Coordinates of C-alpha atoms and ligand atoms in Angstrom, one line a residue:
Chain A
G1206 CA -0.1 5.9 17.9
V1207 CA 0.9 2.7 14.9
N1208 CA -2.0 3.4 12.8
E1209 CA -0.3 7.0 12.0
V1210 CA 3.2 5.5 11.8
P1211 CA 5.6 7.5 14.3
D1212 CA 8.2 5.7 13.3
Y1213 CA 8.1 5.9 9.5
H1214 CA 5.8 9.2 8.9
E1215 CA 8.4 11.6 8.5
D1216 CA 10.5 9.3 5.8
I1217 CA 6.7 8.5 4.0
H1218 CA 6.1 11.6 2.8
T1219 CA 9.8 12.7 1.6
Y1220 CA 9.7 10.0 -0.5
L1221 CA 5.8 10.5 -1.4
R1222 CA 6.8 14.6 -1.3
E1223 CA 9.5 12.4 -4.3
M1224 CA 7.2 9.9 -5.9
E1225 CA 4.5 13.0 -6.5
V1226 CA 7.8 14.5 -8.4
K1227 CA 8.4 11.6 -11.0
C1228 CA 4.5 10.8 -11.8
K1229 CA 3.6 14.2 -12.4
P1230 CA 1.6 14.4 -15.8
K1231 CA 3.0 16.5 -18.8
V1232 CA 1.5 19.9 -17.4
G1233 CA 0.6 21.8 -21.1
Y1234 CA -0.6 18.0 -22.5
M1235 CA -3.9 18.4 -23.3
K1236 CA -3.2 21.5 -26.3
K1237 CA -1.1 18.1 -28.0
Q1238 CA -4.9 16.2 -28.0
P1239 CA -6.2 17.0 -31.9
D1240 CA -9.0 15.6 -30.6
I1241 CA -9.7 15.9 -26.8
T1242 CA -10.4 19.3 -24.5
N1243 CA -10.7 20.4 -20.4
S1244 CA -14.4 19.8 -21.2
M1245 CA -13.7 16.1 -22.5
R1246 CA -11.8 14.7 -19.8
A1247 CA -14.2 17.1 -16.9
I1248 CA -17.6 14.2 -18.3
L1249 CA -14.7 11.7 -17.7
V1250 CA -13.8 12.3 -13.8
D1251 CA -16.9 13.1 -13.4
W1252 CA -18.6 10.4 -14.7
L1253 CA -15.7 7.9 -12.5
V1254 CA -16.4 10.4 -9.6
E1255 CA -19.9 8.6 -10.6
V1256 CA -19.0 5.4 -11.5
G1257 CA -17.4 5.3 -7.8
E1258 CA -20.9 5.8 -5.7
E1259 CA -21.9 3.3 -7.8
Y1260 CA -19.1 0.3 -6.4
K1261 CA -18.7 2.3 -3.1
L1262 CA -15.2 2.5 -4.4
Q1263 CA -12.6 4.4 -1.9
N1264 CA -12.3 8.1 -3.4
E1265 CA -8.3 7.4 -2.8
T1266 CA -8.9 5.1 -6.0
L1267 CA -10.7 7.4 -7.8
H1268 CA -7.3 9.9 -7.3
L1269 CA -5.1 6.8 -8.6
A1270 CA -7.5 6.6 -12.1
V1271 CA -6.9 9.6 -12.8
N1272 CA -3.1 9.6 -12.6
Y1273 CA -2.9 7.5 -14.4
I1274 CA -5.0 8.5 -17.1
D1275 CA -3.4 12.2 -17.1
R1276 CA 0.6 10.6 -17.6
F1277 CA -0.9 8.0 -20.4
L1278 CA -3.3 11.0 -22.0
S1279 CA 0.7 12.7 -21.3
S1280 CA 1.7 10.5 -24.0
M1281 CA -0.4 8.7 -26.1
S1282 CA -2.7 10.5 -28.7
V1283 CA -6.3 9.9 -28.0
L1284 CA -9.5 10.3 -30.1
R1285 CA -13.0 11.1 -28.5
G1286 CA -13.9 8.4 -29.4
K1287 CA -12.2 6.4 -27.2
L1288 CA -11.4 8.2 -23.9
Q1289 CA -14.2 6.4 -21.6
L1290 CA -12.2 3.8 -23.0
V1291 CA -8.8 5.1 -21.1
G1292 CA -10.5 5.9 -18.3
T1293 CA -12.3 2.7 -17.9
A1294 CA -9.5 0.5 -17.9
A1295 CA -7.6 3.2 -15.5
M1296 CA -10.3 3.4 -13.0
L1297 CA -10.3 -1.1 -13.5
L1298 CA -6.4 -0.3 -12.9
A1299 CA -6.7 1.9 -9.3
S1300 CA -9.6 -0.7 -8.8
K1301 CA -7.3 -4.4 -8.5
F1302 CA -4.2 -1.5 -6.8
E1303 CA -6.4 0.1 -4.0
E1304 CA -9.8 -1.8 -3.5
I1305 CA -10.3 -4.7 -1.6
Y1306 CA -12.8 -6.5 -3.8
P1307 CA -12.2 -4.2 -6.8
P1308 CA -16.1 -4.0 -8.7
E1309 CA -15.2 -7.9 -12.2
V1310 CA -14.5 -6.6 -15.4
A1311 CA -17.9 -7.7 -16.0
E1312 CA -19.3 -4.3 -14.2
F1313 CA -16.4 -2.4 -16.0
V1314 CA -18.1 -3.0 -19.6
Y1315 CA -22.0 -2.5 -17.7
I1316 CA -20.9 1.0 -17.4
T1317 CA -19.4 1.5 -20.0
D1318 CA -23.2 1.3 -22.2
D1319 CA -21.7 -1.4 -23.9
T1320 CA -20.0 1.7 -26.0
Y1321 CA -16.7 -1.2 -25.6
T1322 CA -17.3 -5.0 -25.2
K1323 CA -14.7 -7.2 -22.7
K1324 CA -11.9 -7.4 -24.6
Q1325 CA -11.2 -4.0 -25.8
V1326 CA -10.8 -3.3 -21.4
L1327 CA -8.4 -5.9 -21.1
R1328 CA -6.2 -5.1 -23.7
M1329 CA -6.0 -1.6 -22.8
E1330 CA -5.4 -2.6 -19.0
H1331 CA -2.7 -4.0 -20.8
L1332 CA -1.8 -1.0 -22.6
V1333 CA -1.9 1.0 -19.9
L1334 CA 0.4 -0.7 -17.6
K1335 CA 2.7 -0.3 -20.6
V1336 CA 2.7 3.3 -21.3
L1337 CA 2.6 3.4 -17.4
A1338 CA 5.8 0.4 -16.9
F1339 CA 3.6 -0.1 -13.9
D1340 CA 4.4 2.3 -11.7
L1341 CA 0.9 2.5 -10.0
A1342 CA 2.0 3.2 -6.7
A1343 CA 1.4 7.3 -7.3
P1344 CA 1.0 9.8 -4.7
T1345 CA -3.0 11.1 -4.0
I1346 CA -3.7 14.7 -3.3
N1347 CA -5.9 11.7 -0.9
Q1348 CA -2.4 11.0 1.1
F1349 CA -1.4 14.4 1.4
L1350 CA -4.0 15.3 3.7
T1351 CA -4.5 12.9 6.4
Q1352 CA -1.1 13.0 7.0
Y1353 CA -2.2 17.2 7.0
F1354 CA -5.6 15.6 9.0
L1355 CA -2.6 14.8 12.1
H1356 CA -2.0 18.2 13.0
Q1357 CA -5.8 19.2 13.4
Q1358 CA -6.0 20.9 17.9
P1359 CA -8.8 19.1 17.5
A1360 CA -10.0 17.0 15.1
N1361 CA -12.8 18.2 13.1
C1362 CA -14.9 16.2 10.7
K1363 CA -16.6 18.8 9.0
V1364 CA -13.2 20.4 8.1
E1365 CA -11.7 16.6 6.9
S1366 CA -14.6 16.3 4.3
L1367 CA -14.9 20.0 3.1
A1368 CA -11.0 19.8 2.0
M1369 CA -11.5 16.1 0.3
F1370 CA -14.6 17.7 -1.3
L1371 CA -12.1 20.6 -2.6
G1372 CA -9.5 18.2 -3.8
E1373 CA -12.0 15.5 -5.1
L1374 CA -13.1 19.2 -7.2
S1375 CA -10.0 19.9 -9.0
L1376 CA -10.2 16.5 -10.5
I1377 CA -12.3 18.2 -12.7
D1378 CA -10.2 21.4 -13.8
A1379 CA -7.4 20.0 -15.9
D1380 CA -7.0 23.7 -15.9
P1381 CA -5.5 25.0 -13.7
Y1382 CA -5.1 21.9 -11.8
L1383 CA -2.7 19.9 -13.8
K1384 CA -0.2 23.2 -12.6
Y1385 CA -0.7 21.4 -9.1
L1386 CA 1.8 18.9 -7.3
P1387 CA -0.5 16.3 -5.3
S1388 CA 0.8 18.0 -1.7
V1389 CA 0.4 22.0 -2.8
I1390 CA -3.5 20.7 -3.4
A1391 CA -4.0 19.3 -0.3
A1392 CA -2.4 22.2 1.4
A1393 CA -5.2 24.7 -0.3
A1394 CA -7.8 22.9 0.2
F1395 CA -6.8 21.7 3.3
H1396 CA -6.2 25.6 4.4
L1397 CA -9.3 26.7 2.8
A1398 CA -11.7 24.4 4.8
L1399 CA -10.0 25.1 7.6
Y1400 CA -10.5 28.6 7.5
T1401 CA -13.8 27.9 6.4
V1402 CA -15.5 25.5 9.7
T1403 CA -13.2 26.9 11.7
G1404 CA -11.3 30.6 11.3
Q1405 CA -8.1 29.2 11.3
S1406 CA -5.1 28.9 9.2
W1407 CA -2.6 26.3 7.7
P1408 CA -0.6 25.9 10.6
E1409 CA 3.0 26.4 11.8
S1410 CA 3.4 22.7 12.8
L1411 CA 2.4 21.4 9.1
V1412 CA 5.2 25.2 7.7
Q1413 CA 7.9 23.0 9.3
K1414 CA 6.7 19.7 7.6
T1415 CA 5.8 20.7 4.3
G1416 CA 8.1 23.4 4.0
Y1417 CA 4.9 25.6 2.3
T1418 CA 3.4 29.3 3.5
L1419 CA 0.3 30.5 2.6
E1420 CA 2.7 33.0 0.3
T1421 CA 4.3 29.6 -1.3
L1422 CA 0.2 28.4 -1.6
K1423 CA -1.8 31.3 -2.0
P1424 CA -1.4 31.0 -6.2
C1425 CA -3.5 27.1 -5.7
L1426 CA -5.3 29.0 -2.9
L1427 CA -6.7 31.6 -5.3
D1428 CA -7.8 28.8 -7.7
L1429 CA -9.4 26.8 -5.5
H1430 CA -11.3 28.8 -3.7
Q1431 CA -12.2 30.4 -7.3
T1432 CA -13.9 27.0 -7.7
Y1433 CA -15.4 26.8 -4.5
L1434 CA -17.9 30.4 -5.0
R1435 CA -17.9 27.7 -8.8
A1436 CA -18.8 24.8 -7.9
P1437 CA -22.8 25.7 -7.8
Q1438 CA -22.4 26.7 -11.4
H1439 CA -20.5 24.3 -12.8
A1440 CA -21.0 21.9 -15.5
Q1441 CA -19.9 18.9 -13.8
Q1442 CA -22.3 18.3 -10.2
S1443 CA -21.4 14.9 -9.0
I1444 CA -19.1 15.2 -6.4
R1445 CA -21.8 18.1 -5.2
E1446 CA -23.9 15.2 -5.6
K1447 CA -21.7 13.1 -3.3
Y1448 CA -20.7 15.4 -0.2
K1449 CA -24.2 16.3 0.4
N1450 CA -24.1 13.1 2.3
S1451 CA -23.8 12.5 5.2
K1452 CA -21.7 9.9 5.3
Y1453 CA -19.1 12.9 4.1
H1454 CA -21.2 16.1 6.8
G1455 CA -23.1 17.2 4.0
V1456 CA -19.7 19.4 3.3
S1457 CA -21.1 21.1 -0.5
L1458 CA -24.0 22.1 1.3
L1459 CA -21.4 24.8 3.7
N1460 CA -21.3 28.4 2.3
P1461 CA -17.9 29.1 0.6
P1462 CA -16.3 32.5 2.1
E1463 CA -16.4 35.3 -0.3
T1464 CA -13.2 36.8 1.1
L1465 CA -9.9 34.5 2.4
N1466 CA -7.7 37.2 3.3
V1467 CA -4.7 35.9 2.9
Chain B
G106 CA 11.1 -3.3 -20.9
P107 CA 15.0 -3.8 -21.7
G108 CA 14.5 -7.9 -22.1
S109 CA 13.6 -10.4 -24.1
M110 CA 12.4 -14.3 -23.5
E111 CA 15.4 -15.1 -26.6
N112 CA 18.2 -14.3 -24.4
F113 CA 17.2 -16.8 -21.5
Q114 CA 18.3 -20.6 -21.4
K115 CA 15.1 -21.9 -18.4
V116 CA 17.3 -24.7 -16.6
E117 CA 15.0 -26.0 -13.8
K118 CA 11.8 -25.1 -11.4
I119 CA 12.7 -24.2 -8.3
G120 CA 8.7 -23.7 -7.2
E121 CA 5.7 -22.3 -7.4
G122 CA 3.0 -19.5 -6.9
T123 CA -0.5 -19.4 -8.0
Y124 CA -0.6 -17.9 -11.3
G125 CA 2.2 -20.1 -12.4
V126 CA 5.1 -21.7 -12.3
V127 CA 9.3 -20.2 -11.1
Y128 CA 12.0 -21.1 -12.9
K129 CA 15.6 -21.1 -12.7
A130 CA 17.3 -19.3 -15.9
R131 CA 20.1 -17.9 -17.3
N132 CA 21.3 -14.9 -19.1
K133 CA 23.0 -16.0 -22.1
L134 CA 24.3 -12.2 -23.4
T135 CA 25.5 -11.7 -20.2
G136 CA 26.0 -14.7 -17.6
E137 CA 23.5 -13.6 -14.5
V138 CA 21.8 -17.0 -12.7
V139 CA 17.9 -15.8 -12.6
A140 CA 14.7 -16.8 -11.2
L141 CA 11.5 -15.8 -13.5
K142 CA 7.8 -16.2 -12.2
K143 CA 5.2 -16.2 -15.0
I144 CA 1.8 -15.1 -15.2
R145 CA -0.2 -16.8 -17.1
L146 CA -3.0 -14.3 -18.6
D147 CA -4.1 -15.8 -21.3
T148 CA -6.0 -18.3 -18.9
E149 CA -7.5 -14.9 -16.3
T150 CA -11.0 -13.6 -18.0
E151 CA -10.1 -10.9 -15.2
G152 CA -7.0 -9.5 -17.2
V153 CA -4.1 -9.0 -14.9
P154 CA -4.3 -9.8 -11.0
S155 CA -3.4 -7.9 -8.7
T156 CA -1.8 -10.1 -7.2
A157 CA 0.6 -8.9 -10.0
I158 CA 0.1 -5.8 -10.6
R159 CA 0.6 -5.1 -6.1
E160 CA 3.5 -6.7 -6.7
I161 CA 5.2 -5.3 -10.0
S162 CA 4.8 -2.0 -8.8
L163 CA 6.0 -2.1 -5.1
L164 CA 8.8 -4.4 -5.9
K165 CA 10.1 -1.2 -9.0
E166 CA 9.4 1.4 -6.0
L167 CA 11.6 -1.6 -3.2
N168 CA 15.4 -1.0 -4.3
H169 CA 17.3 -2.3 -0.9
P170 CA 20.7 -5.1 -0.5
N171 CA 17.2 -7.2 1.7
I172 CA 14.6 -6.9 -0.5
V173 CA 14.5 -9.3 -3.6
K174 CA 15.5 -7.0 -6.4
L175 CA 12.8 -6.9 -9.6
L176 CA 15.4 -7.1 -12.7
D177 CA 12.3 -6.2 -15.2
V178 CA 8.6 -7.1 -16.0
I179 CA 8.6 -9.0 -19.7
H180 CA 4.6 -8.3 -20.8
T181 CA 3.2 -10.8 -24.1
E182 CA 0.1 -10.5 -25.1
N183 CA -1.1 -14.3 -24.0
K184 CA 2.6 -13.8 -20.6
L185 CA 4.2 -11.8 -17.8
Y186 CA 7.1 -12.9 -16.3
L187 CA 8.7 -11.6 -13.4
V188 CA 12.8 -11.6 -13.7
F189 CA 14.4 -12.0 -10.3
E190 CA 17.6 -11.7 -8.8
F191 CA 18.1 -15.6 -8.1
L192 CA 19.4 -16.7 -4.3
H193 CA 19.5 -20.4 -4.0
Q194 CA 17.0 -21.5 -1.6
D195 CA 14.7 -20.8 1.0
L196 CA 14.8 -20.0 4.7
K197 CA 12.2 -22.7 6.0
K198 CA 14.5 -25.2 3.1
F199 CA 17.5 -24.4 5.6
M200 CA 16.0 -24.7 9.1
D201 CA 14.6 -28.3 7.5
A202 CA 18.1 -29.7 6.1
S203 CA 21.3 -27.7 7.5
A204 CA 20.7 -26.4 11.0
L205 CA 19.5 -30.2 11.9
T206 CA 21.8 -29.1 15.3
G207 CA 21.2 -26.0 14.8
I208 CA 22.4 -22.3 13.6
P209 CA 24.9 -20.9 15.4
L210 CA 23.8 -17.5 17.0
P211 CA 25.6 -14.8 14.2
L212 CA 24.1 -16.4 11.6
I213 CA 20.3 -16.4 13.5
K214 CA 22.2 -12.9 14.1
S215 CA 23.3 -11.5 11.0
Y216 CA 20.1 -12.6 9.6
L217 CA 17.5 -11.2 12.1
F218 CA 19.4 -7.2 11.7
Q219 CA 19.2 -7.6 7.7
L220 CA 15.8 -8.8 7.8
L221 CA 14.8 -6.0 10.2
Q222 CA 16.4 -3.5 7.3
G223 CA 15.2 -5.3 4.4
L224 CA 11.4 -4.2 6.3
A225 CA 12.5 -1.1 8.0
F226 CA 12.8 0.3 4.2
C227 CA 9.4 -0.8 3.4
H228 CA 8.1 -0.1 5.9
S229 CA 10.0 4.5 5.0
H230 CA 8.4 3.8 1.9
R231 CA 4.9 3.4 2.4
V232 CA 4.7 -0.7 1.8
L233 CA 3.2 -3.5 4.2
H234 CA 4.5 -7.1 3.2
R235 CA 1.9 -8.7 5.0
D236 CA 3.6 -12.4 4.4
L237 CA 6.3 -13.2 6.3
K238 CA 7.7 -16.5 6.6
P239 CA 11.1 -18.3 6.4
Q240 CA 8.9 -19.6 3.1
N241 CA 9.5 -16.1 1.6
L242 CA 12.7 -15.4 3.4
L243 CA 15.7 -16.5 0.9
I244 CA 19.2 -16.9 1.3
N245 CA 22.0 -16.9 -1.0
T246 CA 26.0 -18.2 -1.0
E247 CA 27.5 -15.0 0.7
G248 CA 24.6 -14.8 3.3
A249 CA 22.8 -12.3 2.6
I250 CA 19.1 -13.1 3.2
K251 CA 15.6 -11.3 1.8
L252 CA 12.2 -10.7 1.4
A253 CA 10.8 -11.9 -1.2
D254 CA 7.1 -12.7 -2.7
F255 CA 5.2 -9.3 -2.8
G256 CA 1.8 -10.7 -3.9
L257 CA -0.1 -10.2 -0.4
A258 CA 1.9 -7.2 0.0
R259 CA -0.3 -2.6 0.3
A260 CA 1.1 0.3 -0.2
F261 CA -0.4 2.5 2.9
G262 CA -1.8 5.7 3.4
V263 CA -0.6 7.3 6.6
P264 CA -3.0 6.5 8.5
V265 CA -3.7 3.2 7.8
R266 CA -7.0 2.9 6.5
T267 CA -8.8 -0.5 6.4
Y268 CA -6.9 -2.9 4.3
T269 CA -7.6 -6.6 3.7
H270 CA -8.7 -8.7 6.8
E271 CA -6.7 -12.5 7.6
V272 CA -4.0 -11.2 5.5
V273 CA -0.3 -12.8 7.2
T274 CA -0.8 -17.4 7.2
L275 CA -1.5 -17.7 10.1
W276 CA 1.2 -19.4 11.8
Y277 CA 2.7 -16.0 12.0
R278 CA -0.7 -13.5 11.7
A279 CA -1.0 -10.9 15.0
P280 CA -3.3 -11.0 17.4
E281 CA -4.7 -7.9 16.0
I282 CA -5.7 -9.6 13.1
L283 CA -6.6 -12.7 14.0
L284 CA -8.9 -10.3 16.8
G285 CA -10.6 -8.7 14.0
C286 CA -9.9 -4.8 15.2
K287 CA -10.8 -2.1 11.8
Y288 CA -7.1 -1.3 11.8
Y289 CA -3.5 -2.5 11.7
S290 CA -0.5 -1.2 10.4
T291 CA 3.4 -2.0 10.3
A292 CA 3.1 -4.0 13.6
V293 CA 2.1 -7.3 12.0
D294 CA 5.0 -7.6 10.2
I295 CA 7.2 -7.2 13.6
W296 CA 5.1 -9.9 15.1
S297 CA 6.0 -12.2 12.2
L298 CA 9.5 -11.6 12.2
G299 CA 9.1 -11.8 15.9
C300 CA 7.7 -15.3 15.1
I301 CA 10.2 -15.8 12.8
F302 CA 13.7 -15.1 14.9
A303 CA 11.8 -17.5 18.1
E304 CA 11.6 -20.5 15.2
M305 CA 15.2 -19.6 14.0
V306 CA 16.5 -20.9 17.5
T307 CA 14.3 -23.5 18.2
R308 CA 13.4 -24.7 14.2
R309 CA 10.4 -25.4 15.6
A310 CA 7.3 -23.1 14.6
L311 CA 6.5 -20.3 18.0
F312 CA 2.5 -20.8 17.2
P313 CA 1.8 -23.7 15.1
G314 CA -2.3 -23.2 15.1
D315 CA -5.3 -24.9 13.7
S316 CA -7.7 -21.8 13.5
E317 CA -8.3 -19.1 14.1
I318 CA -9.7 -19.1 17.6
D319 CA -6.4 -22.0 18.3
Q320 CA -4.0 -19.8 17.8
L321 CA -5.5 -17.6 19.7
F322 CA -4.7 -19.0 22.9
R323 CA -2.1 -21.0 22.4
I324 CA -0.3 -17.0 21.7
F325 CA -2.3 -16.5 25.4
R326 CA -1.2 -19.8 26.6
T327 CA 2.9 -18.8 25.9
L328 CA 2.3 -14.6 26.7
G329 CA -1.1 -14.6 28.7
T330 CA -4.3 -13.2 28.0
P331 CA -4.0 -10.2 27.3
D332 CA -6.7 -7.3 29.2
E333 CA -6.6 -3.8 29.2
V334 CA -3.6 -2.9 31.8
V335 CA -1.6 -5.3 29.6
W336 CA -3.3 -3.4 25.9
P337 CA -5.6 -0.7 26.4
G338 CA -8.3 -1.9 24.1
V339 CA -9.0 -5.6 24.1
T340 CA -11.3 -6.4 25.3
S341 CA -13.8 -4.4 23.0
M342 CA -11.7 -5.5 19.8
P343 CA -14.7 -7.1 17.1
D344 CA -14.2 -10.7 18.2
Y345 CA -12.5 -10.7 22.1
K346 CA -14.9 -12.7 23.8
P347 CA -15.8 -12.3 28.2
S348 CA -15.4 -16.4 28.0
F349 CA -11.8 -16.9 26.7
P350 CA -9.6 -18.3 28.9
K351 CA -8.0 -16.2 31.3
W352 CA -4.1 -17.4 31.0
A353 CA -0.9 -16.6 32.8
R354 CA 2.1 -14.8 31.4
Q355 CA 4.4 -17.7 31.8
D356 CA 8.7 -16.7 32.3
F357 CA 9.5 -15.6 28.6
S358 CA 13.1 -17.0 28.9
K359 CA 10.9 -20.3 29.5
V360 CA 9.3 -19.5 26.3
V361 CA 12.9 -19.6 23.8
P362 CA 15.3 -21.3 26.3
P363 CA 18.4 -20.8 24.7
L364 CA 18.0 -17.2 24.2
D365 CA 20.6 -14.9 26.2
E366 CA 18.6 -11.8 28.3
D367 CA 19.7 -9.6 25.3
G368 CA 17.7 -12.2 22.5
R369 CA 14.8 -12.0 25.3
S370 CA 14.8 -8.2 25.1
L371 CA 14.1 -8.8 21.3
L372 CA 12.0 -10.6 21.3
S373 CA 10.1 -9.8 23.8
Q374 CA 8.9 -6.2 22.2
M375 CA 8.7 -7.2 19.1
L376 CA 5.8 -9.5 20.9
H377 CA 4.3 -7.0 22.5
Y378 CA 0.1 -7.1 22.3
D379 CA -0.3 -3.2 22.1
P380 CA 0.3 -2.5 18.7
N381 CA 1.3 0.2 19.6
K382 CA 3.9 -0.5 21.9
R383 CA 5.2 -3.1 19.2
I384 CA 8.7 -2.0 18.9
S385 CA 9.3 -1.0 15.0
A386 CA 12.1 -2.2 12.6
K387 CA 13.4 1.5 12.2
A388 CA 13.8 1.0 16.2
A389 CA 14.6 -3.3 16.7
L390 CA 18.3 -2.2 14.8
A391 CA 20.2 -0.6 17.2
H392 CA 18.8 -3.2 20.2
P393 CA 21.8 -4.8 22.0
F394 CA 21.5 -7.9 20.8
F395 CA 23.2 -6.5 17.3
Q396 CA 26.8 -5.5 18.8
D397 CA 28.5 -8.5 17.9
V398 CA 26.5 -8.6 14.2
Ligands
LIG1259 O1 15.0 -18.6 -7.1 C1 13.3 -17.4 -6.7 C2 12.5 -16.4 -6.4 C3 12.7 -16.0 -6.4 BR1 10.4 -16.0 -6.6 C4 12.7 -14.3 -6.2 C5 14.3 -15.3 -6.3 N1 14.8 -16.5 -6.7
LIG1260 O1 -13.7 -22.4 20.8 C1 -14.0 -21.3 20.0 C2 -14.2 -20.2 22.0 C3 -14.7 -19.2 21.8 BR1 -14.0 -17.6 23.8 C4 -14.5 -18.3 20.6 C5 -14.6 -19.1 19.9 N1 -14.7 -20.1 18.8

């Protein structure tokens, strides 16, 4: 029905594909950052996952914030001491964009354990808006995923939650996931989730819609499969903890497949 | 970005939303007439307001002849100026001030057709407007009409999730919103335009309710109280009540008497109870009502 916008979903998909190219971070920016590393960024995103949980924010909000950070760090050098300030301001902006009831600035100051002042948060919000030139309506992994979910026959909630989970894991590790567009990570996540729960594969109908085949998705699939297998060992665990919850059908407890047969 | 305030000469005040005032201004170098919307931030203790973050971010994407054009954003430490293309008047003032013996049908047609083009472009770009009303539709001297005031707008995903409840000025608010439905979509913007179509013909609001419940009852007394046959699910909706009075649907030709068969047809499809059956902007563009635009 109209909640799936039949008359517009194709136009919307096409537009998002265009915009995700525009909104794409520089693939190699971390090497050009003198004082920060992929590992530091992983810590930040993992903390933003917790913040998201603490305040019961939408997952879309989290994905937006990560997009804002990665674009910002693509043109602005940041000292390790200020990385969390960027992230806090990004999460604030994503909240104002995406949430019905965003947390107040004071709450965003509180979660940084008063590392920063309210004035610093507000000034960083302005800087981030200036640097992104207010281009905040970025396509996320999730915007693609929810569309792909409509091609399930029938709908399966473990498949949906598992795909969301895998998509969130990719936010943590800039290497390798900065090289992949949201729509590709979403495809890989969807296929892997579908395969893990039901044994089925990326459907022909989504080949029609996206142009992507299992061949196209193969590189991303291989990384995402590795990430899934290693996830219990990863230094960052907040996503696994989050997806143990019944809200997401406890999908982080599902066993990953040993092989893909691609 | 490109501009600064030194190149603008304020001419007069033309209105105000929240967060401040709108001036008509002239670019001293190019001659361009603009509307400057001031957003005061130094007063704000919560930084840049979310209405402005949505308005700016969404309008930057939406480039269309029937959407008000955002030309620039001047961001000082203390203030935010949105520079817009200037349009002389809104549809409400036009209806009140001229349009004393009516708006001629050709102009009603032209306007509705343009409004539908603007709205289709929004929906094609994942944006709900969520405050369509004559005060937010601007006209120029050339015969164009454009969607304005994207402060209440929202970038949606597919399928939609739960967004802010109680959106849209009451008189223009769709029944699914009024009944507290978990999800609403593009169809709420069509409902508003339906109300606006009627209003262009009569120059009075179609459903001038004084309350949520009064608003519902006015819709029902005009279109009939909906049941499961006309609107599957209606009786399961959070704020549907079995005690609702059961009004009979009146002949649609009595709803807007001056309206021809084609107009009635299009209007009824815009005001369909079931959001799933309500016509899309895209599809309405092809309606026979517009054959002679
Ligand atoms: O008069 C106006 C007001 C706004 Br807001 C935008 C354009 N013109
Ligand atoms: O006045 C009214 C009537 C009904 Br039924 C429900 C709410 N308010």
